[PDB]
Design a protein around this nucleic acid. Sequence first.
RNA 1: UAAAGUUGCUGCAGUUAAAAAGCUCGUAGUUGGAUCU
RNA 2: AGAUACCGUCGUAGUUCCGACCAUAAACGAUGCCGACCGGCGAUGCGGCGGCGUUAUUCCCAUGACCCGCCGGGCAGCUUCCGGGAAACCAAAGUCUUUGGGUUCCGGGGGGAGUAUGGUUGCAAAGCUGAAACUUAAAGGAAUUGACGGAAGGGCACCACC
Lengths: 101, 218, 71, 25, 216, 83, 129, 132
Amino acid sequence: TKKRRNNGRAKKGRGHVQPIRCTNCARCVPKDKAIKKFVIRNIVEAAAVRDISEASVFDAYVLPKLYVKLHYCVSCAIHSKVVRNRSREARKDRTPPPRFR
Amino acid sequence: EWMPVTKLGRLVKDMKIKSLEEIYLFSLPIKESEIIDFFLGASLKDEVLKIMPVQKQTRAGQRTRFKAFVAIGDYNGHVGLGVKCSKEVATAIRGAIILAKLSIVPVRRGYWGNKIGKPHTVPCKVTGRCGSVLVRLIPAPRGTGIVSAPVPKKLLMMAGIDDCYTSARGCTATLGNFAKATFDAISKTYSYLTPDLWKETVFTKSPYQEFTDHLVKT
Amino acid sequence: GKCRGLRTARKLRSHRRDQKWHDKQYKKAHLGTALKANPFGGASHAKGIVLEKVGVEAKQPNSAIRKCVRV
Amino acid sequence: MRAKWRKKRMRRLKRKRRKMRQRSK
Amino acid sequence: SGALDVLQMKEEDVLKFLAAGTHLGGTNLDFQMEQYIYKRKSDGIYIINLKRTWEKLLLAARAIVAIENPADVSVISSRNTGQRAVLKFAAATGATPIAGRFTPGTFTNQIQAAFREPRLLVVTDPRADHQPLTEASYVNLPTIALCNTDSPLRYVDIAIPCNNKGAHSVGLMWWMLAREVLRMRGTISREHPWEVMPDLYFYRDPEEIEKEEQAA
Amino acid sequence: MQNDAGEFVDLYVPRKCSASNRIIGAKDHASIQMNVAEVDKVTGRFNGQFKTYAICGAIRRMGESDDSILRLAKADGIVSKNF
Amino acid sequence: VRMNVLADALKSINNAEKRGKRQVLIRPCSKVIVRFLTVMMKHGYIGEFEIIDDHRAGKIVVNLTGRLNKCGVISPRFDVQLKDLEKWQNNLLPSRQFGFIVLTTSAGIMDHEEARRKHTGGKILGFFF
Amino acid sequence: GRVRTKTVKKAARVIIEKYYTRLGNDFHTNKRVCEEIAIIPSKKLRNKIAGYVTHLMKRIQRGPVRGISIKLQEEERERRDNYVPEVSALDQEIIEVDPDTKEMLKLLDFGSLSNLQVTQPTVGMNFKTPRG
RNA sequence: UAAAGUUGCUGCAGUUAAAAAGCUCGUAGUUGGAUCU
RNA sequence: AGAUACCGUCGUAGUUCCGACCAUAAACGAUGCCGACCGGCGAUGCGGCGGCGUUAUUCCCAUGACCCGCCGGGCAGCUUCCGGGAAACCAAAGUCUUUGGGUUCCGGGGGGAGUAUGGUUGCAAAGCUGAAACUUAAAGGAAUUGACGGAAGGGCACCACC
Ligand SMILES: [Mg+2]
Ligand SMILES: [Mg+2]
Ligand SMILES: [Mg+2]
Ligand SMILES: [Mg+2]
Ligand SMILES: [Mg+2]
Ligand SMILES: [Mg+2]
Ligand SMILES: [Mg+2]
Ligand SMILES: [Mg+2]
Ligand SMILES: [Mg+2]
Ligand SMILES: [Mg+2]
Ligand SMILES: [Mg+2]
Ligand SMILES: [Mg+2]
Ligand SMILES: [Mg+2]
Ligand SMILES: [Mg+2]
Ligand SMILES: [Mg+2]
Ligand SMILES: [Mg+2]
Ligand SMILES: [Mg+2]
Ligand SMILES: [Mg+2]
Ligand SMILES: [Mg+2]
Ligand SMILES: [Mg+2]
Ligand SMILES: [Mg+2]
Ligand SMILES: [Mg+2]
Ligand SMILES: [Mg+2]
Ligand SMILES: [Mg+2]
Ligand SMILES: [Mg+2]
Ligand SMILES: [Mg+2]
Ligand SMILES: [Mg+2]
Ligand SMILES: [Zn+2]
């Protein structure tokens, strides 16, 4: 009984895809199958922003951002709750979750 | 006493429709069981084919219901089949009889060789499908009789077929599918375009359109 | 699929002859090992000398002692 | 028993037979 | 219109169509709605051939008139824009209106209070009145629809290629259909314009109601 | 249809679809029997005569009943030739 | 590659008949195809057809009447004697009141009944009913 | 919680449907009318029905309700629905059309209309949402 | 022997129930486009 | 409890290149190849054709970047009562009792068993071909209702907590 039409990966019209290493557990997982996440955040947190803005020697000095690409295997993605199981009808929906308010 | 709730029932009760073939011509769905009793009447005979217990698993234990298969016919060109599931056997049998006489179709009968006298066999080879069950009916010479399994034979006799050859494939131990496949095969006799039906059709007034003024009154 | 040429009789016959050997009963009847292993040798009946009396325990879920003889 | 380990056990038994059942013998 | 001069479209009808915008379609075109289209202009908007629209409207009127009992025709609207037009059409012609929600099983469940057995069905939008359309296939019910450039035609027998989005267009289509039906019946005449104006069939838009309430 | 003696032997004669010539069965509940009124060429009022069309449910499910009805009306002269 | 032209033409005709089409385009043309279509048309199953003549193998446009249930081809073309015709009639035809088996005989391409009248055998091409 | 069970709501709706004229916005007059017209074998049930009837009457006075409809209200809505402007909104001294619309009208021998005014079409063809 | 359309030429199957060679080339075999009164 | 495991520190063959062997993978789309026919929709990669209008090559064509379309192969996606199937599902897994376009390989209830033996290839590990005696009434596929889960998300309770 096939669970998904695409076999859970994005491989179409090719034979092999080079594997990458899970950020959490260092497992070898094919790149197309792995769960990718691009994280752009601030180096200093919310309170640290106000604490630092007064102690800076510059005027309106913009704090640098942190850019990270994260790769997860299925087990780590499920356990960390970045990915959850869905209903049989809702599995087909592949629209990203409405994070934009 | 019968009080119809549809236009067709009111027309049939008020003696505006002569025969059931008028209803069959316009493919009007039948929603009241009393129409068939009005037309076919005493010629209808029914027979219970199977009583099957089914069970649904619950927290406290299994819940059992009984399903009745009833075939009906007048042995003179009309045949019907009905299935009904209930808690009690008698209620299921009554429901199956009602549902069987509701879904009654006419049967077309043809000849095998020389066309002398009344028709005795199927016009041609007809196939019916249900689940994995496939049933094939083939015309037979006069006096041959019905060469089939006991289950299709009852439906063929109730339809009014005298002679026929029968083939069957699939898991025929499923009595419901076995009966429904041959019922479909019998129903497909009037849906086959033979060269003697090539004449252009002359249309006629529909009973709804013909008796609209009488329907307005009642 | 199957070959439907007009000159394919040899292929069809050879294939059927070779694929009849995958039938359990045909191979059992035509191989000769079963006939060799059959104590009767193909006979309907046989005559023997009773060596002794034995009791065989009935398989579960039945419980009994079936009386048999070694001959 | 897992089929992979059953196959490995069969292979090891066959190798043991081959060592014991020498072609010279 | 069998090429009859009496049934030809006049200039005032063309002006009404142009003002209501019935000739303006959507950006998408259905593959079975392509014989009623004329040409796709820039910005992706499709233009509808008004002569074919008039032909389809006259054919629908001929189909409606052929029914003896006027009450056997059911007119159904689900969207709010068509409800007032359907009610006015039913009042002027004698049909049975269904404005708002359509209850499933109306044509099939014979023990319900609202069980009906119409002989003809007229709808405002196949994509919005799909539920009444689907139940027509169960009881041998012919259907008439006001379709658009992108509209499915399953179970639709007579499709009138108009613009069913704007309130003015829907009201004008219903008013013209009622006028044609009445003129074919032999109730009003073709020699003088109809007494009622086509603005009685338009959607009220309670914002407009509030604006008019405070006019004086 | 009939025997050697010529006597007709059938329960009824089913009607065929006007679009595809297929037989409309007794259990085909998606079939339509539609009537189109005829008008007088002089006045344009209802003549009292009508033309009858029959469409099977298979065509209707295909969404091809609109074109079939249009062509049938054009053939009968109800719809203008320069449609 | 394409190895039978009559098979392709008959399959196209049958598929177009199932879909309720009014006309069918079949290419390439062949005189065997023309004979088969003529045999079918003489019994009123298809109707008039027109041969479009390009300079390479031609094409045919066939009108449909909706009277055709099944038209098919038999491969390979088996030799049929006059005493073995009844078996093919029983196997392939739906009834004994309608349907025709098409044969190519030394007299020409005809149906099984016309071959019985002329007392000749041949090779089976196809059937239609 | 003070949610009313369906019995109270059904009785109140039927009472308002049948006797809309006799009711008002006063709880005590409503509860005196209810015992006159309806048979309630309980005092608390009668009080609940009257208290819901008063709330529903206030809601009706504010505007139309999703449920019941009064015959007088329906007739008055007909009068509000026969509103007719003095002039037709379709009547325009100038109607703007695109050149393709003018060609379509011309093909139907309607190119002689004076109300038509040809407007310049948009120069750029960009009518699709940017994919992304 | 029929039942067995469970040896299937008529007439069986090969995604998940038993099953299509890891892939390609290729001899024999099988099959092969129209057209001549 | 016990770890000869999962965890942590080291660490030998190996992991890297050249030359000889080995020919096995859930080597999978668990779906042979060639050809014909049979519904829509929007994208996408390559080539070609046509057309308002923005940009760069300071001017001009012309050529690049966009925009709107058409044709042909290709990887796919959505939808459909085209039709199939036990169903899951499939525009092929359709055009099959209305059964024949050509052709190759290949299966015959579950185990014994891909085992023994013979043959053959390899340095070896092993690869290919490949049984029987005997044993058994089921093994298995898809889906449905329950019960469980050291699975996910909600709700309620001073016989729960705060
Ligand atoms: Mg699973
Ligand atoms: Mg490739
Ligand atoms: Mg791979
Ligand atoms: Mg993934
Ligand atoms: Mg069994
Ligand atoms: Mg065995
Ligand atoms: Mg016991
Ligand atoms: Mg046997
Ligand atoms: Mg047999
Ligand atoms: Mg056997
Ligand atoms: Mg057979
Ligand atoms: Mg089998
Ligand atoms: Mg398998
Ligand atoms: Mg493969
Ligand atoms: Mg060769
Ligand atoms: Mg040749
Ligand atoms: Mg392998
Ligand atoms: Mg794979
Ligand atoms: Mg494989
Ligand atoms: Mg493309
Ligand atoms: Mg490319
Ligand atoms: Mg390009
Ligand atoms: Mg077959
Ligand atoms: Mg086996
Ligand atoms: Mg037992
Ligand atoms: Mg406690
Ligand atoms: Mg506490
Ligand atoms: Zn991981």
